[PDB]
Amino acid sequence: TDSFWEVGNYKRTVKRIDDGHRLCNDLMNCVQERAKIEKAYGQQLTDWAKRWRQLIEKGPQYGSLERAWGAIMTEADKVSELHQEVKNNLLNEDLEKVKNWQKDAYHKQIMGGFKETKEAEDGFRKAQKPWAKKMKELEAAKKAYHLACKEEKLAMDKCKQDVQKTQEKYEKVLEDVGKTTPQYMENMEQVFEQCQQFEEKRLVFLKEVLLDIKRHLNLAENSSYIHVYRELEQAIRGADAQEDLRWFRSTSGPGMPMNWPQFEEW
Template identity: 35%
Template sequence: MTGNGEFEDQICSNGSSFWECRAYQRTVKRVDGANKLCSELCLMIQERAELEKAYSSNLKKWSARWLSFLDSGLEYGTGSCPWRGLCKEAEAISNIHLNVRNILLDEIQTGLKHWQKEHFHKSSLPPQNLKETKQFDQDFELAQKLWAKRLKRAHCTKKEYYQACKTERSLQVQVQNAKNDPSGTAEQNGDKKSTRCTGSYTIQLEHKKLKKIQEKLAKAEKDVQRTRNAYKLAIAELDTESARYVEEMTKVFTRTQDFERERLCFFKETFNNLHNALNVCAKADYDSIYNELAHSISQCDIESDLQWWSVNHGVDMPFVFPRFEEYSPELAAMSHKKRGTIIDHGLPVTLTNVTTISSPVDRHSTVTSTNNSEHNDVRLDNGVISSPNGPQSVIHTPFDDKASKMSTPPPTTTSADGDGNDEVVSSGACDSEVNDATYDDGRPGVKVRALYDYVGQEDDEISFVAGDVFDKLEEADDQGWCKGRKDGRAGLYPANYVEVLHKEDP
């Protein structure tokens, strides 16, 4: 007999309804997800605060540098006013963004951490799971315990009843065969290779065997009636328990919904506070950005989210009560005839569109291959970029130090090809996976002509029509596919769809 844990796991895997055994685990794990969301939102706010601080610091450095430049006296008279005005504007913007950083950390992030600490409590002993998760899990398990026990009882009695019906039907067939064939079948007679019985002795022996089978049939009929009654009784007990089960499970689920509603309300309030803190610019071209953010926050409908969860993972899901199902020999026989789908990968490729080539010369297609040379820009030591369009100057900013570290290209290695030319190979290219089917190394191929039309079914296949001429790069594999190149693109095609062109062929 299947253990209780294995039976519950089987129920969970077969049905996704909230009312199945231990299917409430998704709702319980939502509490763990809420705690993780709080931590991730804190990290998100922390990173944004660091960006605001870095921007403020760079603005101050930029302002101090150009104020120092003005002290040299190179710009004179009222011409220095615009310079100093730009520096003062940078200091003002710097103070604003520094204030944003302080609000993000001192008010919003601190409040979020405090709320998380009040609503989520970890156990003192390893593995330090959330107490709220454990409590909800225990409450759901207690509400489901008796119902799950009776459901298991109904499942077992159903299995016993079906097995008794199968045994009864098998014995009925044996009795019928024994009555129709007095000599008995090979299975009923046993091993009688050398034993031969005469007349009356054989008839008496067959009567005894028939009587034994009939006795087994009578016992099987009693088992069918007994297991049938037990199955009906188990279903009746399950129906009696279902009302209480629904009520208790709904109570616990409502508590989880209230807990999640509180988190959603707090998150919406936090997002509104973030919007107010970040909306520091009153320029017309910035209004659209912050108005769009405000609109996205206003679309947060808490009740709609909770209702969606209830419909898809909660008490509003359909509750199908187990009902008595009569045994059907036809369905039982059909279940033994199921076979897995067998895929024979060795079958040849089926021709989908066969076209006769009347004039191969008229159907030739020109194979073109273009090799585009890549021009790499070279940064010189004097801060000038050499490119095909001419040298370009580079303006250094206070962000160059960080930007250069973040955007440093991967190291390259230099190798010489057969002509003595250096070839630069990026180490990043070695890490990426190359699709062998579509990778073209530029090597020459063997000219082939298409005999039939073929339309590629996958991304790594090439298409052609009868009469097209293209290159074959590799011989056919054990599956009957060749690698070729057509119109500058490499891919796979069926080997028996083409023929090799000889020099005398047009």
């Protein structure tokens, strides 16, 4: 009853066509939303780097340790930058890739749906029509047979002569679907198969696009990411306690020059 082969149930295959277009929509929003998220994190990082760069500067921390601490603000700028690159790929490549695929792939016609949906719809309607008509008729038949046996019940007459003519109409219409069935089957097989081909393009494209996206997301492949931490670490390792102590000593402590009191005149 639910089977493809019953009248009208080819519609699921048709519905699927409409679906693909919408599914391009869904994916495009998916990416945009993702990019928004990356954008927010890069943004919040630069704001932070900017806060702290300024607070370290203005503040009493001095020396190489001021610079080491400052370096973290340098990672936050770099990382921020990588996330903005992610956002820009997501948006400029992948979304535009999908936008383009959809545009060239579905055609709004007039009205009034996509052209690729209607072609399928018309193909199925044409493949199912003789058959659908035979199927209504075969239907009408059985009951007239289901109407001439049961009839024999009370009057049991032109009764065994009306079994013998509704039974043969029925039997003959039956014989005749038997005959139209393999064409009816060949014909469905074709529209359907043209539908698989279209859907296959879309799915093949999807798989490619997902991969594009994985790549634009994978910060941890890229050398730059691995490098910002190689570089942060060595900057901190650069800081010397003893260095800043000596610096304070000579610029602010006992190491400063003094003009020791002498004799004066005038």
